[PDB]
Scaffold this active site. Structure first.
Site, mmCIF file in Angstrom:
data_model
loop_
_atom_site.group_PDB
_atom_site.id
_atom_site.type_symbol
_atom_site.label_atom_id
_atom_site.label_comp_id
_atom_site.label_asym_id
_atom_site.label_seq_id
_atom_site.Cartn_x
_atom_site.Cartn_y
_atom_site.Cartn_z
ATOM 1 N N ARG A 234 0.875 -1.185 0.000
ATOM 2 C CA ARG A 234 0.000 0.000 0.000
ATOM 3 C C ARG A 234 0.885 1.199 0.000
ATOM 4 O O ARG A 234 1.947 1.180 0.572
ATOM 5 C CB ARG A 234 -0.882 0.077 1.304
ATOM 6 C CG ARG A 234 -1.961 -0.995 1.434
ATOM 7 C CD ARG A 234 -3.205 -0.788 0.558
ATOM 8 N NE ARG A 234 -3.706 0.571 0.720
ATOM 9 C CZ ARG A 234 -4.282 1.052 1.836
ATOM 10 N NH1 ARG A 234 -4.462 0.294 2.921
ATOM 11 N NH2 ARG A 234 -4.681 2.323 1.871
ATOM 12 N N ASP A 258 4.261 -0.317 -7.274
ATOM 13 C CA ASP A 258 2.936 -0.507 -7.863
ATOM 14 C C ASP A 258 1.836 0.280 -7.117
ATOM 15 O O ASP A 258 0.701 0.367 -7.619
ATOM 16 C CB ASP A 258 2.545 -1.980 -7.906
ATOM 17 C CG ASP A 258 1.284 -2.206 -8.737
ATOM 18 O OD1 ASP A 258 1.282 -1.875 -9.953
ATOM 19 O OD2 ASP A 258 0.267 -2.704 -8.198
ATOM 20 N N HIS A 295 -0.924 0.700 -10.021
ATOM 21 C CA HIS A 295 -1.667 -0.331 -9.289
ATOM 22 C C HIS A 295 -2.221 -1.420 -10.202
ATOM 23 O O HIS A 295 -3.456 -1.611 -10.365
ATOM 24 C CB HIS A 295 -2.752 0.270 -8.419
ATOM 25 C CG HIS A 295 -3.140 -0.630 -7.282
ATOM 26 N ND1 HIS A 295 -3.523 -0.142 -6.060
ATOM 27 C CD2 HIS A 295 -3.078 -1.980 -7.151
ATOM 28 C CE1 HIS A 295 -3.680 -1.154 -5.214
ATOM 29 N NE2 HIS A 295 -3.433 -2.284 -5.856
#
Lengths: 329, 328, 328, 329
Positions: A234, A258, A295
């Site tokens: 995250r 990511d 993401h």
């Protein structure tokens, strides 16, 4: 039962249509973002399916409810964009995907490692243009390197098993160690020792008050000089601002992201026509030894099928009164 | 006192050979220019010349080196197509080389090519760098569960197989001489044509010989699974590149990763970006969205380069002691 | 017999200086390496050294050249910030240069930067090369009818003005010493601040002096027309680059074309792509979609390079005849 | 009066909305292409506004007519995509834009010249990545060079005047020479002499049976070795296939295209996710000294405003029974 999808991509329609073969819902795909002035499109629709870049603040929820929407289904794990207190007040339940496919996500982490190591993104751009020269593209063997896995939940474990197959020496940190990591040949140790010993560090721990900004300027300075860091976990696990100076000095050798802390406002959209407002992200994007994917780690056909199946099942469950993957304030 | 002149020198040659020289003390000279008829004169008075595959070692060049007092040609490569070996033997100018590259470096490169093609990481990078964070067209596939066909189960093919087994792939293999290590990984041997029909990803690792020359030709490409990925880190002449074009255009071949290309010694290892590329087939391959080409970069790690330098300097020391090693 | 060693040599230096040498017959030596303390030894025995702006001509380097028998430093550049002139004079080591670059080469480059930014040609190229033939975001504006402000109406500014007049632009100008040629083109002189408020495109061509240093600073950027285009082919220190960032982020500055950058002699003329760029301001500028930077390329035409070579070899011949030209 | 736009881009909506301030039509913007299976969207719409990549073959026209569409307005000059015989048979009139803004188009040609000359597209890509090296980027002064203008209509003349301002020596070929070209300092001469003498050749003649494949292998071999060719006119003015060998040999030094003979099937769409089928275009796109823009030469705000004004005026005119810019079989 009618479902309106906001922020729809072709990969959403393709996965949800296939997953609908065991539901027969009526699926409507709107490309536009959900926000105050597009909420009207959901008028008369019982279910609205949103992604993380959709606006589910109080004003939008009120409008959906007044228009007769009875469920908000998030085709995501994350829900920062949702005012849950407001949804509860309005009697509008929220469901989500509890977790993304661990193979898809761990595979993507390994892909970021290899592209960075072998400079494959730089090579591609050279050879595409007839530049076959190899200066600056030298990498390192993964075999024999120390790979530190922070968080040995499902994704971290899956990542660890893949990296063990390359012949890496696996190091791990988790508040609750498990024997599976051990059976792979993995050694648990203190976080600080993991950071000092590892050639490659990969984040897979949940975000909590304790892991927020886990990799901050202090943790970066603990790492081995020239090491590689990968964050597919995250955005807020890392203090992106502190990564810059570490990349400038060479202290951090490589970075693969990511996820990014400001991402729901940035990602999933083509912003290339306009200046980028975020100074930190803009600077990260410039470095030759940084790769950022938007993401994308769950973006495989199988992982998207799992998200679609889960989301349609969540919707069938709400319909029947079964609390399945509800998010509560 | 050994003096060695390197042609076609890169900074990574200088770095690796300087480190390997710790236990030799040879006098190392690094010339960027290519070896050819008109630069051979630079080797004047050097008893050893160290060459890479793009250097010109045809008879005229050899004969000039010999006249100039060069007594050994050391190739910092496994390949030697650029060497007229007959002419060297005639001149009594021995030629030594590196027998094999690091199997971990080369297999890991092949896996990187896989992942970059699957997840479109090269395309993603070029989007995000410009603030395009949109994901259309970038959807890949899980490797877990897929069938991976390894053609040639020598050292590199075996190493590649172990890695792919760790992803939870189902391993298929073809080799004239199967081995049990592949088996222990969970690998199944089968006919070449059956491997090709069943595999989601096919990777070439077999030696180039008269039998494997153009092993992947138009007929073999048609036998493959529609949409499949092909990886060639082995040798350019294993594939008929010209056939790959139509297969890519139709979608029959879903992805292609190449680290080698037939006659690459004429193309690779130089920045040719200032001029039209003459090769129509390579130019076409380069511009597909689902093709990545690296320029024989699979051994380009620090450790693999150190092995090449250690081997080459040991080859030179062995020749110096009157007991040559790794002569061709 | 004149022998000249060139440091920081490019193929375009070798080509242009070889052609200019037709009427001199000097012995020309082209070294790729930069001049610095530890490469000065290469100039050993050379009576003339030819340097570019990125070469190191601080006192330690000069003093080594002089000891090694170098008697003239010829700069193949107009600029000389890298030269310790006091130390050279102290050593009796004269320094010659090129007084000015080709005005047509430099003005045409500025117009190219205009057009590429306007029509997003750099962005278009990168789309089409990859099969993206979509046009979103590429819409430009006609130059015809627009107000173009020329700051500095010397030779380059004047040449730039004539070109832009031929597009049917309305020409505005600022110079402390206006001239009638600008007038004859249809140009109007006015106050600097009024030029900036009225102009759709502003181009810098004035000399750098204490008065013009940071001429375009945050206040001047705010005085400009919202959305306007700024071009700086003049000198890096004409602009406060750091102020350009916030102006670009807000949209106050619509476009930016730079061929120069303050302290560019430390950054430009080298491939630095393998390493992080340390300069935060330049790194930020590079990644905006509406900024194009060229690396002091505005004099990079065959004809402008021929003028630089002809001038430099004539400067060297003049020094040789005991009557030096273009000394600094 | 209701108008449905197929193949709509943001720049279409923006220009046509502004132009509508003196009409008050009801404008509907559909992103999808017109074709057999999207024609149904035009049901009940009196006017459909199409671009060149829309399918107006007989089957589509029949469906629009049956659905009550009474006018097809092309927001383009070109109309190859229209079966006019079928439209006449069906009583469905077709109108178009007679010509694009000459300043926009001639400016774009000059931009292609300068980018190619100074390699600005290559420079950008280098400096963006921290490559400040100048090898291979050397250009040539335009001042003093011979520029040959083939076709001295409005766009050719406009182009000629701009290039005259750079101090170029202007050469021209047109079946019907005009004195304006002469007043610029331009010299008319035979086509073959233009081709042999010119450093830069720019096509601006109409496409007809006589100019089809005007630049073919023979004409390319007439040109000065290393010359630059610019085609912003029409794709079929050149035999693209013959350009390849000329670029490979160095006979042709540079190429700038804004048009291509197969373009209505290729351009105006993002095809980057799929292999390109066209071998010739794919090969052109590869060369370091070729720049292709996707019929972008009229893509300025002013030129788009002219297209919108013209198209809305054409529609008002049809309404009143005034034959304005009708295309007839």
């Amino acid at each position: 039962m009618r479902i309106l999808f906001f922020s729809s991509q072709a990969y959403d329609s393709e996965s949800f249509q296939a997953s609908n073969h065991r539901h027969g819902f009526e699926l409507h795909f709107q490309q536009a973002h959900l926000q105050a002035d597009t909420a009207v499109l959901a008028q008369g629709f019982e279910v609205v399916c949103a992604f993380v870049n959709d606006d589910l603040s109080r004003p939008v929820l009120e409008r959906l409810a007044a228009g007769g929407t009875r469920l908000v289904a998030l085709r995501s794990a994350g829900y920062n964009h949702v005012d849950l207190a407001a949804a509860e007040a309005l009697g509008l339940p929220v469901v989500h995907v509890p977790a993304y496919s661990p193979h898809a996500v761990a595979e993507h982490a390994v892909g970021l490692i290899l592209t960075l190591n072998r400079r494959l993104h730089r090579a591609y751009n050279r050879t595409r243009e007839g530049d076959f020269s190899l200066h600056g593209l030298t990498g390192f063997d993964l075999h024999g390197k120390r790979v530190g896995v922070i968080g040995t939940g499902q994704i971290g474990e899956t990542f660890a098993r893949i990296m063990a197959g390359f012949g890496c020496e696996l190091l791990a940190y988790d508040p609750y160690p498990n024997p599976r990591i051990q059976a792979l040949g993995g050694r648990y140790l203190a976080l600080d020792a993991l950071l000092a010993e590892s050639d490659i560090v990969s984040l897979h721990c949940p975000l909590t008050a304790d892991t927020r900004h886990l990799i901050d300027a202090q943790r970066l300075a603990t790492m081995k000089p020239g090491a590689m860091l990968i964050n597919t976990g995250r955005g807020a696990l890392v203090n992106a601002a502190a990564l810059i100076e570490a990349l400038k000095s060479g202290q951090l050798g490589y970075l693969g992201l990511d996820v990014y802390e400001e991402e729901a406002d940035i990602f999933f959209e083509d912003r290339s026509d306009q200046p980028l407002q975020d100074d930190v992200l803009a600077r990260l994007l410039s470095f030759p030894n940084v790769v950022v994917t938007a993401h994308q780690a769950f973006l495989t056909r199988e992982a998207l099928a799992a998200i679609a199946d889960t989301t349609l099942d969540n919707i069938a469950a709400w319909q029947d009164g079964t609390p399945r993957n509800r998010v509560r304030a």
